[PDB]
């Protein structure tokens, strides 16, 4: 009922601009102050900007002063965050948040009642690139055995994310798809692994399905022992 | 600028346990401290404001206390849906400030990792770069040390690590380590090894292959 809908995120090269939007519904919008909060991947929460209910007073973190501009539109019940001179340090998921009232009293400084779903901002000089997919072949140092491990190296793609399934979804037990790491080149790389019984090798085929929609890339890599 | 310091950074507990998280401020914030809950992929969720006032709908097992500089969040009996990250927030003054966060994890018995090493594929070798991957599978607790060695030479600055969350069925972790070399460097040496130090191991486990077909 009461919710904040966000939009405007995306991938942008360093030094460019972006404008975030937060549309409110279900509550009196222009009675509340409003805040923008961001959270870098793996990091914690950081407040970036706030504005009073009437738009007369605006507050900024030191990290964004002179660069970010907060504003609001009462007719549209919409909150804005104009972000200029973006740098990779600004890569995060951005939220709009509403300070909680205390028994009818609207205070801009309180715990944050309601949060938007978030919109992701990526600041990178990298260009869209499909992943290279390499097999992590299962091994042996005898002929028979117990449980074997095989996997899929999804390397050098941009931007996030890639989806990985095994045998078109028929293989889910023992699967670990690891979070991507950001390499020095600016491209991402992750690996998906699965543990199988050693009797399966040779009899059962293992196919790793990698989809990267930003580049319309779809790869089916069969992983067999060398 | 007021800075908040949460303690501890993480805690492992079982369902039914009593968990106590503290938040310390560099200045006095009277009673303008809020507590949040966050699960991966979702926005934060307010639990406490005014340092003791429960949000509407939040279970009564969540209690907040304290004033001035020292504060405390308490969960009187942990429930399965309470394993998440918890943040304190200061609302005494601008700028608004969050604590580093406290992650409450599922406690279980020690589990030693299964270690696997994977040589680079021949398809990648044609591109001019080689990636050796090492897998640590289903271990607990999370603390582990992976050291790469090539011809017994300890590597530095050419590897990256990635860890999953606790598995939904056995509460263990898994870890992937990727050593990245140039093909010329890779063909220049023979034995590639992955050394794993974990408290479930009496001695470090090393897995190794040697380049060729061995």
Numbering used by the authors:
A (entry chain A): 1 to 226
B (entry chain B): 1 to 214
The publication says:
PN-SIA28 had a large number of somatic mutations in both VH3-30*01 and VK1-12*01 genes compared to the unmutated common ancestor, and has a long heavy chain complementarity determining region 3 (CDRH3) (16 amino acids). We determined the structures of the PN-SIA28 Fab fragment alone at 2.5 Å and of its Fab variable fragment complexes with H1, H14, or H18 HA at 3.2, 3.4, and 2.6 Å resolution, respectively. The high-resolution structures of the PN-SIA28 Fab alone and PN-SIA28 Fab variable fragment in complex with H18 HA allow us to analyze conformational changes of PN-SIA28 upon HA binding in detail. The structural alignment of PN-SIA28 and PN-SIA28/H18 reveal that their CDR conformations are almost identical, except for CDRH3. The CDRH3 loop formed by residues 97-100 G undergoes a largely rigid-body rotation, pivoted around S96 (CDRH3) and L100H (CDRH3) to facilitate interactions with HA. Additionally, the side chain of F103 (CDRH3) moves by 4.5 Å to fit into the hydrophobic groove of the epitope. The structural characterization of PN-SIA28 bound and unbound structures highlights its long and flexible CDRH3, which can accommodate the differences in conformation and environment in the hydrophobic grove of the HA. Given that the CDRL conformations in PN-SIA28 bound and unbound structures are almost the same and CDRLs in PN-SIA28/HA complexes only interact with Helix A of different HAs, the different Helix A orientations in different HAs cause them bind to different CDRLs.
